[PDB]
Design an enzyme around this catalytic site. Structure first.
Site, mmCIF file in Angstrom:
data_model
loop_
_atom_site.group_PDB
_atom_site.id
_atom_site.type_symbol
_atom_site.label_atom_id
_atom_site.label_comp_id
_atom_site.label_asym_id
_atom_site.label_seq_id
_atom_site.Cartn_x
_atom_site.Cartn_y
_atom_site.Cartn_z
ATOM 1 N N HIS B 41 0.810 -1.232 0.000
ATOM 2 C CA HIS B 41 0.000 0.000 0.000
ATOM 3 C C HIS B 41 0.848 1.289 0.000
ATOM 4 C CE1 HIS B 41 -0.107 -0.210 4.522
ATOM 5 N NE2 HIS B 41 0.076 1.101 4.384
ATOM 6 N N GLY B 143 2.157 5.742 9.749
ATOM 7 C CA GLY B 143 3.577 5.702 9.415
ATOM 8 C C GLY B 143 4.299 4.497 10.005
ATOM 9 N N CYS B 145 3.497 1.454 9.446
ATOM 10 C CA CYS B 145 3.403 0.353 8.493
ATOM 11 C C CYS B 145 4.770 -0.073 7.997
ATOM 12 C CB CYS B 145 2.482 0.729 7.336
ATOM 13 S SG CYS B 145 0.819 1.227 7.850
HETATM 14 O O1 LIG Z 1 -4.150 1.447 8.735
HETATM 15 C C1 LIG Z 1 -3.294 2.191 8.260
HETATM 16 C C2 LIG Z 1 -3.307 2.595 6.799
HETATM 17 C C3 LIG Z 1 -4.096 1.602 5.976
HETATM 18 C C4 LIG Z 1 -5.450 1.789 5.733
HETATM 19 C C5 LIG Z 1 -6.194 0.821 5.075
HETATM 20 C C6 LIG Z 1 -5.592 -0.355 4.651
HETATM 21 C C7 LIG Z 1 -4.238 -0.520 4.872
HETATM 22 CL CL1 LIG Z 1 -3.455 -1.991 4.348
HETATM 23 C C8 LIG Z 1 -3.486 0.440 5.514
HETATM 24 N N1 LIG Z 1 -2.306 2.734 8.990
HETATM 25 C C9 LIG Z 1 -2.090 2.572 10.375
HETATM 26 C C10 LIG Z 1 -1.526 1.420 10.911
HETATM 27 N N2 LIG Z 1 -1.383 1.204 12.221
HETATM 28 C C11 LIG Z 1 -1.802 2.156 13.039
HETATM 29 C C12 LIG Z 1 -2.402 3.398 12.652
HETATM 30 N N3 LIG Z 1 -2.819 4.331 13.573
HETATM 31 C C13 LIG Z 1 -3.382 5.436 13.105
HETATM 32 C C14 LIG Z 1 -3.579 5.709 11.755
HETATM 33 C C15 LIG Z 1 -3.165 4.794 10.831
HETATM 34 C C16 LIG Z 1 -2.550 3.596 11.258
#
Ligand SMILES: O=C(Cc1cccc(Cl)c1)Nc1cncc2ncccc12
Ligand SMILES: O=C(Cc1cccc(Cl)c1)Nc1cncc2ncccc12
EC number: 3.4.19.12
Lengths: 304, 304
Positions: B41, B143, B145
């Site tokens: 992603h 961030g 990820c």
């Molecule tokens: O979830 C996502 C982006 C996302 C969205 C939809 C699909 C995918 Cl594969 C990835 N990022 C985050 C990861 N962990 C924690 C977070 N905490 C806050 C904001 C964002 C976070």
């Protein structure tokens, strides 16, 4: 989101760990620049530990008696000196992996990461607090002595603790990197009073703010309190009295959530008086005091 | 003595972390040998996240669009490929800090350490379990990820997890290092059912053995149970059914303490039926399931 008992990345400290052997005793040393720091009890035998005469024991030792090994390579000892409860072994080679560092004396209630080591080899890393009574509730076995506690701010490691001893109660005692014990402890195999401990109020409040930030809000109520009223409850429940300096350090978390510090105190008061009623906060069924206000903001803002 | 939620020392993994930027998105990558692994992603914009056509999005990208920075130095991308939900960026330089490593797919109920990172820079390390429903309850922000989960056995790092997503419920989802999601999750910004979770029975039992080893014994009783009877209680309290394979892995802890596994099951049954009555076990007021039997023996024996 999410809140965990997060330790600092240990890489910078792993590069400093060495094994120090003297006679039949082996423990860990911290190699920074051309000096290796380790607990002075490395010079003792079991017959000495009841009440060692460290000055006399060290006079029988020479540079060549201190075997210092960094992984598989041997370090050459060109000097030794005792400073308080630590030995400083001067070596002929500066550690090429020496990070930017400081030696600091932390205050009770502050937190730090411990890199538990055995035979100069890292085994694990965990976060903990220096209790108000200057003990730490760590995880250490025989041979863990010389493992260190630290905090990291960007590229600088601030070493604050070196592990020395486990008291008969199973709690841990150690020194700053100048060899001064935190608390009243002495490096002898004797029962030693730790003294009354208390819960770190400012840290519990910081963790309640972390809970609100990370979605747990069931404990918020319609009440407020004063420092005076809250401190009567803190007294009853063996919590540290809250001061305006603690309220001031909780400022950023109060601004982030919009919850006045005294309103959060009223939530803490209700939880102290009524318990959790079978509920949890951030995966805990007790009030957690091992996160400082700085820890909460750092973890909730992703500082690297 | 003492028992803590201990993570593996993160040094070997810190040396592998890099920043990967594509277009306007930045996340973390894992640089092993001449390959950088990161969540696919990274190629998306916010308009894509509802349901990205990853194949089409990647066709618009060339090697020079993937900016990979290891600290302050730029890596030259000579190839890219998508494997499941990960991108593999071939670089012209092997990471000189590549440790001995493996890619493993962990089972639900197993534990691992996470090195949370932002912009290729490590922020903190923590231990956690892969839930029976294939989610993790981590600590991650935007961030994070590309941060990875791992276990270390001597000098070999077994990478088992790469962080991808936070579900609307605040729980975390990710992949093995071949890009296969743990659980039913897809890398899209949609609500996704995680499914019924359960408590990891074998790990709770291991932690009760750790408690006995480390001095907490108030929960031991005069009773025993059978696998069948215990499993009726496990059913009622949403615990995983205990099998003979779980009893077998608890063998070493049963031998160390002299407490038969079924006798420890009877203590767990009484704690499930009666609660803790305001008491604690190893500083917890709930039954902990994030320590495997292997974790307990390792922490209680000081493996490095
Ligand atoms: O979830 C996502 C982006 C996302 C969205 C939809 C699909 C995918 Cl594969 C990835 N990022 C985050 C990861 N962990 C924690 C977070 N905490 C806050 C904001 C964002 C976070
Ligand atoms: O306490 C000592 C040795 C000791 C005795 C008396 C005075 C001093 Cl300064 C040092 N070592 C240990 C440290 N931490 C944890 C342990 N766990 C088990 C056994 C031993 C441990």
């Amino acid at each position: 989101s999410g809140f965990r008992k997060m330790a600092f990345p240990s890489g910078k400290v792993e590069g400093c760990m060495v094994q120090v052997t003297c006679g039949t005793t082996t423990l860990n040393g911290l190699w920074l620049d051309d000096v290796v720091y380790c607990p002075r009890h490395v010079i003792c035998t079991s017959e000495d530990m009841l009440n060692p005469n460290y000055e006399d024991l060290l006079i029988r030792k020479s540079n060549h008696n201190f075997l210092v090994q960094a992984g598989n390579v041997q370090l050459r000892v060109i000097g030794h000196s005792m400073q308080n409860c630590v030995l400083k072994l001067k070596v002929d080679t500066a550690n090429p992996k020496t990070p930017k560092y400081k030696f600091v004396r932390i205050q009770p209630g502050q937190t730090f990461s411990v890199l538990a080591c055995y035979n100069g080899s890292p085994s694990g890393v965990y976060q903990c607090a220096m209790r108000p009574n200057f003990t730490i509730k760590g995880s250490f076995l025989n041979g863990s002595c010389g493992s260190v506690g630290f905090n990291i701010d960007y590229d600088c490691v601030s070493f604050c603790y070196m592990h020395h001893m486990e008291l008969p109660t199973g709690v841990h005692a150690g020194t700053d990197l100048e060899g001064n014990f935190y608390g009243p402890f002495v490096d002898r195999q004797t029962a030693q009073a730790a003294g009354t401990d208390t819960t770190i109020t400012v840290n519990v409040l910081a963790w309640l703010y972390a809970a609100v930030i990370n979605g747990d809000r069931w404990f918020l109520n319609r009440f407020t309190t004063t420092l005076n009223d809250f401190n009567l409850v803190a007294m009853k429940y063996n919590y540290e009295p809250l001061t305006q300096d603690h309220v001031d350090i909780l400022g950023p978390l109060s601004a982030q959530t919009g919850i006045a510090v005294l309103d959060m105190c009223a939530s803490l008061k209700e939880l102290l008086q009524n318990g959790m009623n079978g509920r949890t906060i951030l995966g805990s069924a007790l009030l957690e005091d091992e996160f400082t206000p700085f820890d909460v903001v750092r973890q909730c803002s992703g500082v690297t």
